[PDB]
Amino acid sequence: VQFRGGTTAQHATFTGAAREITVDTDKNTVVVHDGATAGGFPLARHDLVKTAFIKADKSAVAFTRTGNATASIKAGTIVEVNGKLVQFTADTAITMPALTAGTDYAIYVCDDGTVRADSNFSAPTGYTSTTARKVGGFHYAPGSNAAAQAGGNTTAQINEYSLWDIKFRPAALDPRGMTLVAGAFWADIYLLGVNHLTDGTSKYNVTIADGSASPKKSTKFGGDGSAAYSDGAWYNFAEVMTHHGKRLPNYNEFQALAFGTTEATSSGGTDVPTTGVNGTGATSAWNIFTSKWGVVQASGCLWTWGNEFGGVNGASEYTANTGGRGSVYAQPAAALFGGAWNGTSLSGSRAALWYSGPSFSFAFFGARGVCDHLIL
Amino acid sequence: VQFRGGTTAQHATFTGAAREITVDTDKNTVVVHDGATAGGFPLARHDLVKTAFIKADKSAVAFTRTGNATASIKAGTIVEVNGKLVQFTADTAITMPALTAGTDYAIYVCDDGTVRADSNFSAPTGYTSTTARKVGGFHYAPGSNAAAQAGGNTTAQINEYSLWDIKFRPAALDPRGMTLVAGAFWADIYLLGVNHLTDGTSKYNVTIADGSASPKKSTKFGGDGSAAYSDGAWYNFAEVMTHHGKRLPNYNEFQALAFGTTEATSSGGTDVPTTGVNGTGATSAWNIFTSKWGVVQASGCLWTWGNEFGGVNGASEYTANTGGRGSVYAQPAAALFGGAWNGTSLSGSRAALWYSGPSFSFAFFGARGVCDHLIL
Amino acid sequence: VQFRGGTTAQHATFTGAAREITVDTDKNTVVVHDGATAGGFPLARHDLVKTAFIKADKSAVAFTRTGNATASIKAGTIVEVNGKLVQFTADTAITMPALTAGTDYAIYVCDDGTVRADSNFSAPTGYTSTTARKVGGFHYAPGSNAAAQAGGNTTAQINEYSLWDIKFRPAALDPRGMTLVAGAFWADIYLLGVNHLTDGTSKYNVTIADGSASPKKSTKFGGDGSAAYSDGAWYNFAEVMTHHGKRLPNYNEFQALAFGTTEATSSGGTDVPTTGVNGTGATSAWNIFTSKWGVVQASGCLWTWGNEFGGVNGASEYTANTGGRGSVYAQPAAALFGGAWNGTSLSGSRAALWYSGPSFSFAFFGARGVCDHLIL
Ligand SMILES: [Mg+2]
Ligand SMILES: [Mg+2]
């Protein structure tokens, strides 16, 4: 049984009858007619909505934290997956696996109509990347967010602001282990690791990069993949953030990301070698330094290099101190934020040092990444 | 009447005949056939195109200002609304309500085909938020944009540059009261007001937040809703902007946004308390200071905190002047731009003072929000 | 041959038998029925997927460089065009026109299903802009990208990093002549030219705008189209980049964009007047200074104004040197990056001079443009 239609050319001058239906054999699609309009009204093929993702409210993430280890996908969420339409007419709970503290999770909507979370970032368990479509994700943090200005506990839970969908996410290449600050931008939850190449910039429980344990050399910038930079200069940390589509914080970004940390306090001890854990001889616990947004070790554990210049200038005369890539002249200091483990009273969300030249390297100087917030 | 059916599983290994129409009982959709392809060619369900919005020219707003109190939606605009498709094949006038000077309006495309503007940002008069879709809006200014470099006048009219649509808008979380500057970025039309929590950062005829009468404390940073900040520190304004997903203008931004103001001229008198009105005992009228882009009181009224550090340094010794959030060493000044009522002939689009540290606070230091331009 | 359908009102409370097809005369669309659900299942009109563009991997450009003068469109690409659906199920070679060194090309997809490049940015030869759709583009460079840190050659070829599609492009208002740096942002390939108004900012083999040969006044800021600026001031270059929706680079950006250049080397000679060719009396070839991402004359040719302030301040009193647009107090120098031709061995990817005020101008002070990377 066949309905006669012709080419798109044929259809162009053809006017079907009110409620008549022809077939465009060029497009392979149905065309509805109204008995008055030349060409009719072609319908859309499904190939042209492949990957559609409609949220009821586009200005907020697609999910909700319902408990410490539970989350729901919001009502009104329409999702194309593997030729099929999956939609949720009411808030729907997301099936979780086991949740280890300090790990990242991806959220999948599957072609059977079920929504599941998983530690794997290609496909969840018992599905392929064709049967399941990754739509978002979250971080399962070691501790809670700062309920006020004292920090948070050490109850492992979902970081409410680490929730991202594919149209409400960090601008950077990989969205993992970042958190939405004030709904304005994204900050790395953890300070930059040494193995940022395999781990990402922001990972829980890894060696923190500093003047000594300097970061792996960026492969985008002539790094071989296991070699590290010879020092912990600003130049080096700035190079690393670029490689991951991020930048160092500015003052206004820092004072914001780190709010909620315990002010004018430091980790104490002789070192903070590891993200999310207590420092070597720490006189106060890591979670005392946890922002309102779940930025871990926000302040007073390690100075982060910044992306702003000013303060104390170097020699008013050309100096070749740039890892042998040119010379500086009257070179202003590159900001350092937060304080480190050993400035007791000095540390905090607005703590700022404008003395160090960008070529300076010390074991109190690391970095935290940021990037824009993109809503689509 | 009922057509040859089958499940997606069944459709998979089935080749229909040229112009045969089958129904996929799983997908609930029509499938066109060509007598050649396995599985045929499934059509798209309308849900997967919900909220669609297609512009003819994607790098321009969807509307044209046609006169002081009239504007039109451009030809080629296709809007999905409430299951319906509404489109404008020619330029169509937008139905205006009463327009009061210094008001923001929203533009709605209704399912009955009409396009109207209303002061209400949820639904126009005699429509539900289902039957009408908000697609953009504009600001009805209290005066003209600056034709030359002598400011504008006092004739209420649509600021042409203030037109935004859902895919051509300020990146900020709320589009109201902003104006697009040289198609590069968005700027607040008005200086930051005290009650920015209920008014947004930019609003006509409100009290201008300054060092004395400072801004309401930010909800997202531990404000309660009634509390003001203690003073008008750079730190505070910076934080108020971050709240609304805006930031302070940099030098390049400022010089762009303020262009068209009457250069080397100040308001005179003793104070500027209100946005969009004349200053207290002022010597030249407020519109003298309107920019090419409809930025009201662009210069020579209040200094605006910028987002750039440099110039005169504070003490070369840690100082706890950050409202109790850490200490600062050799802190460079936060830039201020524009000049103020007392500024005499120093005011203008490139007026810049690199003196005050971020901790300073005066009755002639305020702020203006800027943000990114979003084209989708 | 009619199908019994009615209005949307009517459809609202109606249930067809499983596989009954009706016509919504309001929406002019087909409605599938299941036997259970009221209102049925309205299908999507083609209008609502007009301009659709679907990549298999959204985080990468849609094309692949296959050799010096050949490229393919990636498998999985789906393009709506002129009411039709063109789609590439495997890597398909783009049809190349005649390739000339230092020219931008636009990649089109056409309703006859063919994919071709062309120097015309409206339509390829033998098509209207209705039958062909601009989807991407690239730069045919005068030399090669930097293999390591010695620069490149003079073999004309496709700069692989200059590939852009409509959902993977410079945020700038016009994507021509840019190249993506480490996947984080886009940088102009060429130093800003005098006739940027008609050439864009980044164009091969034109006069490089400097202090003597100042650029043309932006028509967005009072320029007429003929008039040049009186000097090569930071203020002016900054104005020019705003006009084109770009920024002056920052330090983190510059070290990135210029990486791969021959470090500690300058053009030598007396002057460098033209983009992409050797300087007047130069002692090193122009391609010696070609970056990893094919930034041409990246360093050691002209100081490029930066978008950072710090270093040497100026008169600690209100000076009016902003070309009549107000006064500056204790004005911090504007950064200058890369070094110039005279600079000798100071020049390089990190060469930075914080001495010159924003009002200074010299015949070795130019600019390069940058903008964000847009992914959709
Ligand atoms: Mg800056
Ligand atoms: Mg600075």
Numbering used by the authors:
A (entry chain B), B (entry chain C), C (entry chain A): 5 to 380
Excerpt from the publication:
We isolated, crystallized, and determined the structure of Mtd-P1 (120 kDa per trimer) bound to the 60 kDa ectodomain of B. bronchiseptica pertactin (Prn-E; residues 38–640). Structure determination to 3.16 Å resolution revealed that a single Mtd-P1 trimer, although possessing three independent receptor-binding sites, associated with just one Prn-E molecule. Two independent copies of the ∼180 kDa Mtd-P1·Prn-E complex occupied the asymmetric unit of the crystal. A total of ∼2300 Å2 was buried at the Mtd-P1·Prn-E interface. Two loops of pertactin emanating from its β-helix scaffold contacted Mtd. These loops nestled separately into two of the three receptor-binding sites of Mtd. The third receptor-binding site of Mtd was unoccupied and sterically occluded from binding another Prn-E molecule. One of the contacting pertactin loops, composed of residues 399–407, formed the majority of the interactions with a total of ∼870 Å2 being buried at this interface and was called the “major loop”. The other loop, composed of residues 190–199, made less extensive but nevertheless essential interactions (see below), with a total of ∼585 Å2 being buried at this interface, and was called the “minor loop”. Although the three separate and independent binding sites of Mtd-P1 interacted with different chemical environments, they were strikingly indistinguishable in conformation from one another and from unbound Mtd-P1.
Mtd is a pyramid-shaped trimeric protein that localizes to the ends of phage tail fibers and functions as the phage's receptor-binding protein. DGR-programmed variation of Mtd enables the phage to use alternative Bordetella receptors for infection. Variation in Mtd is focused on 12 adenine-encoded amino acids that are fixed in position and scattered across its C-terminal region. The 12 variable residues are organized into receptor-binding sites by the C-type lectin fold of Mtd.
